Design a protein around this ligand. Structure first.
Ligand SMILES: CC1(C)[C@H](C(=O)Nc2ccccc2-c2ccccc2)[C@@H]1C(=O)O
Ligand SMILES: [Cl-]
Ligand SMILES: [Cl-]
Length: 134
């Protein structure tokens, strides 16, 4: 009974494009990029009232965030950046902005056919991560 209902469920990574370079731009070192780049994370999205929870389990790291749309929160990312995060819903698309050390990256999640498509942008580096229902 929510707009994020399209996103609710368990999703598994099925394809990746340009992710190594996105990780490099975000400050991930060589060894961490090599290991992290092998991973096939899941994405588990749930809603309880106004609280949205996004969990990611993988060999690299398990993470979990809970948030209210529009409200900034602290996040420690899978690659150990300590960031200030705001997530909003803009015309059906979940838009996640992460700010740290004067830098910023945007991760958008959208439903496209049976897929959940994730676009990751840092400066002029864009990566696409495609998920399907688990
Ligand atoms: C882009 C999305 C939404 C998550 C995320 O925050 N990923 C990362 C972002 C920066 C650095 C590393 C990762 C990462 C790499 C491997 C495994 C887990 C996280 C999902 C993903 O599909 O990777
Ligand atoms: Cl590193
Ligand atoms: Cl872990």
């Amino acid at each position: 009974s929510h707009m994020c209902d399209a996103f609710v469920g368990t999703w598994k990574l099925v394809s990746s494009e340009n992710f190594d370079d996105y990780m490099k731009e975000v400050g991930v070192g060589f060894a961490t990029r090599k290991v992290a780049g092998m991973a096939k994370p899941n994405m588990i999205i749930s809603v309880n009232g106004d609280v949205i929870t996004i969990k990611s389990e993988s060999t690299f790291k398990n993470t979990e965030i809970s948030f209210i749309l529009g409200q900034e929160f602290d996040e420690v990312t899978a690659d150990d950046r300590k960031v200030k995060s705001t997530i909003t819903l803009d015309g059906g698309v979940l838009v996640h902005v992460q700010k740290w050390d004067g830098k910023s990256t945007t991760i958008k999640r959208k439903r496209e056919d049976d897929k959940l498509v994730v676009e990751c942008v840092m400066k002029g580096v864009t990566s696409t991560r495609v998920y399907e229902r688990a």
